[PDB]
Design a binder for this molecule. Structure first.
Ligand SMILES: [Cl-]
Ligand SMILES: [Cl-]
Ligand SMILES: [Cl-]
Ligand code: NA
Ligand code: NA
Ligand SMILES: [Ru+3]
Length: 129
């Protein structure tokens, strides 16, 4: 599913991401924009052989099981395929664990490079929330 900008903001807010660990809703929408262009079905293979899944491009090296990432963990206790659902519950609940791991949203390199320090409120501007 490809979400609209405000549609995804609303879904993320409903699932408890707004200001989760102090990160405002615009940060999460901005990260989703540059990780996946709001497409729940996005996948991308990493040079180390792991794969990133879903709206927030969550990596199989640590967070989900895909059966093809040797030596990896599954810290969210989910098949990586669950991260591709039209229902963002699995992606949100796993992102809560990721952002709580110590480095905040810097875990998402694209957030650090393209959202951090920017006017992220623009990503939720105009949305009925
Ligand atoms: Cl915001
Ligand atoms: Cl594996
Ligand atoms: Cl980047
Ligand atoms: Na894994
Ligand atoms: Na939902
Ligand atoms: Ru860690």
């Amino acid at each position: 599913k490809v979400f609209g900008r405000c549609e995804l903001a609303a879904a993320m807010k409903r699932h408890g991401l707004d200001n989760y660990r102090g990160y405002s809703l615009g940060n999460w929408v901005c990260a989703a924009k540059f990780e996946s262009n709001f497409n729940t079905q996005a996948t991308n293979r990493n040079t180390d052989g792991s794969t990133d899944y879903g709206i927030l491009q969550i990596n199989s090296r640590w967070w989900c099981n895909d059966g093809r990432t040797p030596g990896s963990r599954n810290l969210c206790n989910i098949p990586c395929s669950a991260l591709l659902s039209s229902d963002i519950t699995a992606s949100v609940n796993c992102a809560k664990k990721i952002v709580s791991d110590g480095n905040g949203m810097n875990a998402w390199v694209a957030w650090r490079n393209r959202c951090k320090g920017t006017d992220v409120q623009a990503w939720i501007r105009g949305c009925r929330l």
